[PDB]
Amino acid sequence: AAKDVKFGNDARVKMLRGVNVLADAVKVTLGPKGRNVVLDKSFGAPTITKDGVSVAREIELEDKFENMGAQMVKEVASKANDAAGDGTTTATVLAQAIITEGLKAVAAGMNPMDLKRGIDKAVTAAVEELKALSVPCSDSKAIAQVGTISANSDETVGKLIAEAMDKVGKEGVITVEDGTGLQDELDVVEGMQFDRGYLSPYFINKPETGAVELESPFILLADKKISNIREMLPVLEAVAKAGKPLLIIAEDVEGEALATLVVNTMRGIVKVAAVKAPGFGDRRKAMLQDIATLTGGTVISEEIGMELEKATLEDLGQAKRVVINKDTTTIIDGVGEEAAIQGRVAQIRQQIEEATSDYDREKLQERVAKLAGGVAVIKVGAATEVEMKEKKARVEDALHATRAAVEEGVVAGGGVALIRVASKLADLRGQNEDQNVGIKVALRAMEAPLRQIVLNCGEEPSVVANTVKGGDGNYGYNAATEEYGNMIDMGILDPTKVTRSALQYAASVAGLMITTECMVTDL
Amino acid sequence: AAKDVKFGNDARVKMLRGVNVLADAVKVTLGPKGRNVVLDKSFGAPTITKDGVSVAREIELEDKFENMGAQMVKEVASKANDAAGDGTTTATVLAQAIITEGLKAVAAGMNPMDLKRGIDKAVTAAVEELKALSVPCSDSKAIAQVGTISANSDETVGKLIAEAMDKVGKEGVITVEDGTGLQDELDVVEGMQFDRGYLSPYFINKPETGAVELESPFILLADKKISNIREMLPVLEAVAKAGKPLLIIAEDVEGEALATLVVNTMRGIVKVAAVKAPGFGDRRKAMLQDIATLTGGTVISEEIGMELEKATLEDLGQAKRVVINKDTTTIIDGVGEEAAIQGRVAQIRQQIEEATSDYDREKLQERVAKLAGGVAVIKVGAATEVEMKEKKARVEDALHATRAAVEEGVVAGGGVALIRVASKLADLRGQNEDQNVGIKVALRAMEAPLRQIVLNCGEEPSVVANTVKGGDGNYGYNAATEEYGNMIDMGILDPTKVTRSALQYAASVAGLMITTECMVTDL
Amino acid sequence: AAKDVKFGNDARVKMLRGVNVLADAVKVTLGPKGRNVVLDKSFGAPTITKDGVSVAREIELEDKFENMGAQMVKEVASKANDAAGDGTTTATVLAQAIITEGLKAVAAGMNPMDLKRGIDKAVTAAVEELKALSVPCSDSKAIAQVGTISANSDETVGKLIAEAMDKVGKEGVITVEDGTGLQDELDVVEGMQFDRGYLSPYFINKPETGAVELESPFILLADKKISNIREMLPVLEAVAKAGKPLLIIAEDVEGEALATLVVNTMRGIVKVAAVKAPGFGDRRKAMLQDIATLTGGTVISEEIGMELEKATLEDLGQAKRVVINKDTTTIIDGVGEEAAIQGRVAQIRQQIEEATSDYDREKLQERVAKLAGGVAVIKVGAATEVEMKEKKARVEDALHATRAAVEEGVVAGGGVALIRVASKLADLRGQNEDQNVGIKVALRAMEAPLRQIVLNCGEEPSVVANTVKGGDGNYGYNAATEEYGNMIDMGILDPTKVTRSALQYAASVAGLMITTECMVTDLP
């Protein structure tokens, strides 16, 4: 009292109303037949939209309690979108479906801990069914279909990503850069990606991107654990007139050594970063000289007879742009060399025929692909900059979904996946009636996505849900045409990772929400 | 309680009310015998305009939801005006007629999606008859009549436009410039129009014109895909003391080179733009040298032996003004040459006697017209600058409307065209009762313009509407004189694109209003 | 008047609030450590009571949807008392528990009707099991104990009830009334007596005693008014020759006749006294025939056409002695024939079997007791009237409890009976899983009485309830001493009738109420 503090049921019922108001604004846009929501634009001509994310972002309820219910749901929905490139609205709608019955059933006096345990049991079991249902992402055709769906059925995006994957292979690194002009373009350049990131948070980027990138960086290739960089300072000072950044790749990023010294080298006013070389031992040596050829640098070490005092601006590698995150780095376009790379790749290829000792065979057979086909760079063109930004975002999210799909396969989309597994878990039961109500509420929510999508079409949801449950395999309702058919033949594919993630996160909040007992907020 | 978020009928009912206040303010002005609207002005002496556009501007409702209902209708009306030079109020009236009946039927619980589908069916069917009713703009008299009706019966404007088109021909490019004095003037100068615009948004103009124009521009006529402009900076720097702009017209506007380098050339402080030469290959060559003669330039290319290092300010063309849009370019008046053009045109005409090969016949037979009649420039004279500004604006709309009429012909004005097709489609029926009522709503709305015109005139709409439906052909009611007669002989003509466009846009909003479910607006 | 309507959970929550508000007011009285409730009555001093039904009847709530709940459960609290007297508090606690747990299961989405049938099945089995546990009660020690327990642990009341039921026998009728001493008193009446005194003081032969006593008197029963001495002469003549005294029973004695007897008595010609007939109406005729039977006399009445002028010494009844007070008449050792008296008793007992009204039925028991047993009066002693209505109510409830005990047996008190029967039904099942829940909800609620008894003491309820279920037989928890033991050795006994009654009526109401879907009532 006397502050907006309240306890027990008086708290929950405020949240319930908050979540419900948010959800009613989102679910109406779910699927391809979303029905318009109007958002006020201060200048007039209010923007008319069919996008869940664009709607859910605007809502800032004025009641300080109802706001919180909205924000925590919005929050988790966004995190599911970061795990996989879609499903913001799916997670939101599922969250309403579970939470609604959860808060009512607790208000009837059920034990909230048993409800939590019951929901968690059902969701944990269901995830195992998805693992059995998933099929591998067999071909670039599926890549295309996954792409379009992620892009509101924009075919064009899918062809680019499909084509890009054809140049560099499904697993190859793809990057997107702003439009050179009216029309899209695709090209390949001698980049270099490896699975090492920056080890210190102070190497964070200036923008909030989490990953950091350096433009026109020099590349130091120090093939030892670097106990001393003082002999590099004259080179940095000669570069300091230009300010050109330095990225460090090291056999080890020795902490009290080079890493500390680099951290001391900048007061925020020097562009430096450091990462380990990829692999271990001879692999770091090998890929350090690979990067040297790719960047036009040389390997630094005393065993090579190459002190940092000797390191000219051409013994250091160089690249036009490079990106680093918490765990990963990619060179996009090293200045590099032509014939030296061709010869080294041929030598590495020859080594594959002899370095067949299993884990050594790998290092060769990746490194050949590390040099050749460095990176493909999509250029996004549109009639105006407004569409260019829009298209770019669409492409970038579409890209993510495709990667998620190829990493963990696809399942029949359009909500059939959830309604399918719901039939198989129906026999599951808990230790007591509280858990049984927990189990039932979980399986009730799993049907909500299909029922919502169809209802938007202007259809009787009851008939379709029965028909899809009575069917078998990937038989389902194609909302885009009102025809029934096989989703895999129809190309309605959802990446398994987004569906799994959207379920787990929604259930986490619902369980997390049940066990809230007090809030402390300002008047 | 909450932010002003609200759903379903509670939202729609607000929209309906907002739309109605707007339409009732505007619809009373429709037709040549409108009724006065007293627009307020803070200085006193209110303006009392009869102009629907002027009234539509000010309407700005207090109640946020009521406001939104007005603004979206207002917006779509404006888009209709940009598509064709009239029909703002016609589109508004049709919008109100559909919306009102639509929302009523929805509130009764009619399936909203089925209602939409019904509307779009009738509109799609109806346009086919309008296509059939169109007739060619055969003669300057039809030009004039379309003009006057577009200019509130100002015969002056129709005469001016008629004369200008008689000078340069219907297809020829015409421009309007501020008055040189008390009296209107018309004259011709060596302009050149071709349907190529600037390929990058960063060449957008400073004002909001969308198109961009350059005054006293220099013209580069580069007959290759320009992979390198570095050799031009010395010429541009020599010009930078005067700041006279340079336009690049290229055989190809090379994307990653020419465009990127040009983009890099200006930091918002250099007047540079680039466009493709018209046609392909030898066509671009031909018209490039045409432009060269018209501008006093020369063709740039290594095969010609004219590097940009060699390109003086007289190998570059010059003009006093040039205009560029998203899809089209015209030079207004190149500095050019006299006898060189005359000899060139004569040669082209001679080539027409031998360029019988059709891909040449079409490439030759235009270029002759490209030289002669380059542009006509109407000067609008008036007794005051206030009348000047208003008058020019009207002339510009009459210009737009005339182009529309020549593009898609004309049909009987005064609502006769809509009420005619409405009678033909009375047999049209849909798959179910929800779609059937949807059809009835659309066919009723299409009659609204005629009944609104006559009602403003202070006559009995029942009798006139029945008489026009009992007639045949272009028979109709002349509101300016209350005589019945053949509309075409009285010159009451509307460009078909105006009627076609206004109907489709009204339907689109009406369809889009039925299927809205939620609002978001600030407190 | 305009109605208001509510649906679904928005109705049941309001209803549940009402029942709980009533039930908590009753609950607090339960068990030996329960506490008193103060009842406002506008006429005068408020009355404090422990009787659960007394409070429950007075409760009514302002909010209509809350009031509906109280007004329904009020029935169980009342009906239990009407049926069996004691045990109304228990019935209430059960009802609230079943409603709470039943409605909770409905929130899980179970079909309500299947819960109802499940509960009804569980009670039907449990009542049958109680018939197995019940053991006969007949000895004076057990009756004394069950009296004490119902009295709220007053040994004195128990002892008085045990002696009273012994003296008047099983057919005798016992009644309780407001006394005047500080200490309780028992009055016992033997033989026929009725509340009519001598019509004149001058009959008084023992003025120091203030009463008339007559030896071996003739008893004349005239079904008519005495108005003219002409009617009486032959009987007086015959009795005067016989010399035995005569008592007149008549509808009235007119002053002329009355004064003539007064002269004859004062002058010592005939010893005679006259009294009004008891009661009035047809019951007067019945009672006249009954006293006639006890005396072996004959009722002279105009309906049979008999005449007092024709009555004979053979028609009058006889008794060894009579005594009549200012307000009371008693007849000692009527010469009526035992077999005829017994046959008359059988006829009236057949009327008792036919008696549709328990109040009328009681007046018949009074008659059979007056004819063939005794009647006793218990006078409650206390210093102030608020103590009268306190003590009075508890003594009253003991009287009902002991009756039900002797006529149906006893079971271990302290609610342990319900605990021990509930465990036996663990294997009972219904036609479907919803009925299985309905069964389990019923067996769960049967623990509620024990949990409340303990909780009033401030002990931890769920530890006692667990440990009692760990035992076997009559092992239970004695709240008075806070020790475990065999309930029968402490004599903590409940008469099976009340327990069985409380269960059936509780489940009958609650098992319906949970099915409520809509409630309609006037706007406030």
Ligand SMILES: Nc1ncnc2c1ncn2[C@@H]1O[C@H](COP(=O)(O)OP(=O)(O)O)[C@@H](O)[C@H]1O
């Ligand atoms: N042609 C289609 N038929 C049926 N369902 C579709 C079709 N295309 C997409 N969907 C479904 O739309 C859902 C996603 O809708 P969307 O508006 O992207 O919400 P979110 O952004 O939260 O994923 C997915 O479940 C997807 O399978």
Ligand SMILES: Nc1ncnc2c1ncn2[C@@H]1O[C@H](COP(=O)(O)OP(=O)(O)O)[C@@H](O)[C@H]1O
């Ligand atoms: N003499 C006339 N008789 C009948 N209708 C006319 C006449 N002149 C113009 N109109 C009609 O007026 C309508 C447009 O009115 P206007 O005031 O221009 O509104 P808007 O500017 O929105 O078109 C056209 O449909 C046109 O055919």
Ligand SMILES: Nc1ncnc2c1ncn2[C@@H]1O[C@H](COP(=O)(O)OP(=O)(O)O)[C@@H](O)[C@H]1O
């Ligand atoms: N000494 C005792 N120990 C434990 N339980 C007792 C004791 N005396 C009475 N009880 C129990 O308390 C209840 C009687 O209390 P009472 O206030 O009369 O409630 P009710 O009005 O429902 O009979 C019975 O269940 C009886 O078995």
Ligand SMILES: [K+]
């Ligand atoms: K959508």
Ligand SMILES: [K+]
């Ligand atoms: K007008």
Ligand SMILES: [Mg+2]
């Ligand atoms: Mg999506």
Ligand SMILES: [Mg+2]
């Ligand atoms: Mg107009």
Ligand SMILES: [Mg+2]
């Ligand atoms: Mg009791």
